[PDB]
């Protein structure tokens, strides 16, 4: 089974050969669903082998059947489970492209009924369903995601909770000007606000995040100025140790997506102490990160490096050290 940090390539090709001969079964044995979960948890080569076999997931049908068998009723659970735990980038498109509408509605079905780990997998798949386009996030919302998520920030499960948080960052950053605008309408912000004030570091770091992202547009700064969440960003930041607060969240993770940071960038000019302040943290943590994997020219190619050096002027020493720690980080 799973052991530790070592150089094994054997098991990356035995558990994939292994579910690859379960999908093809097709015309339960859903251990497909433990084995990835605990493939996911392996200490530091966790990575690799989730994205492999969730490869070699889409790559023997699975995906497709996975996406066709969530509309029978006895597989559909069962179905989405797994669905949850392999949305990886090239997933998420295939879901996207060749049926949106059966995985919103499961997830929504499955954040209706009160059982909870249903709950934990609906929230989550919405959450990784908000970080494709703004056409994607528009038409999630109009098939219910949002509302889903929004009733979901009522719950006391953490887990579900942390799905919906990092739900409305992803869609602060990929939404656009008209989604925001509806986020607005759906009264984002007063949900987000009993998340902001969680005692999990977790929670309480994505709703300011999303409430941040929120603010850069500058026709609904004043509405989620109301909310009262971003006056917590200055004690958090400068009472948290960002090698530390990113092991413990997205180190695991190669840390986010080069279009999730660069979504993130126009926020480093915002009108907004706290806004600059939580997004220089974000990238002095991601900096670090990218450094350990090697892949730190994304901050160039994203453009990231005039909104760094241009914080790391700025009078505000807050977003300036991290800003210039970050720089450093890339060079
Ligand atoms: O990136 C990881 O190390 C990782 C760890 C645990 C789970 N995953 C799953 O891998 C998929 C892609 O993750 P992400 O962060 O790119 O949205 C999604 O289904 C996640 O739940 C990914």
Not at 34 to 62: D, F, K, M
Not at 66 to 85: G, I, R, T, Y
Not at 145 to 164: I, K, M, N, Q, Y
Not at 221 to 243: I, M, N, R, Y
Request: aromatic content about 6%; overall charge negative.
């Amino acid at each position: 089974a799973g052991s530790g940090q070592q150089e094994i390539e054997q098991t990356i090709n035995k558990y994939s050969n292994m579910l690859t001969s379960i999908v093809s079964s097709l015309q339960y044995l859903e251990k497909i669903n433990e084995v990835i979960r605990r493939a996911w948890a392996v200490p530091t080569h966790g990575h690799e082998l989730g994205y492999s076999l969730c490869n070699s997931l889409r790559q023997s049908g699975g995906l497709d059947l996975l996406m066709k068998n969530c509309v029978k009723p006895d597989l559909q659970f069962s179905s989405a489970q797994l669905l949850e735990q392999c949305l990886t980038t090239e997933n998420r498109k295939h879901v996207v492209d060749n049926g949106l509408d059966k995985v919103v509605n499961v997830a929504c079905v499955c954040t209706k009924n009160s059982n909870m780990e249903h709950s934990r997998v609906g929230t989550g798949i919405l959450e990784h369903l908000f970080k494709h386009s703004e056409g994607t996030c528009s038409d999630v919302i109009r098939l219910g995601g949002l509302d889903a998520v929004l009733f979901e920030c009522r719950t006391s499960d953490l887990e579900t909770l942390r799905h919906c948080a990092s739900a409305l960052a992803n869609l602060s950053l990929y939404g656009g000007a008209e989604n925001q605008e509806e986020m607005i309408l759906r009264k984002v912000p007063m949900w987000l606000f009993p998340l902001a004030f969680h005692n999990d570091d977790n929670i309480k770091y994505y709703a300011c995040l999303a409430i941040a992202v929120l603010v850069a547009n500058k026709e609904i700064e004043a509405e989620v100025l109301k909310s009262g969440c971003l006056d917590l960003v200055e004690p958090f930041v400068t009472s948290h140790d960002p090698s530390a607060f990113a092991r413990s969240n997205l180190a695991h993770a190669h840390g986010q997506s080069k279009h999730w940071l660069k979504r993130l960038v126009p926020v480093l000019s915002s009108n907004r102490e706290e806004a600059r302040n939580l997004a220089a943290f974000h990238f002095c943590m991601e900096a670090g990160i990218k450094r350990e994997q090697g892949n730190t020219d994304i901050f160039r190619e994203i453009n990231a490096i005039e909104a760094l050096k241009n914080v790391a002027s700025c009078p505000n020493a807050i977003a300036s050290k991290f800003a210039a720690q970050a720089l450093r980080l890339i060079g």
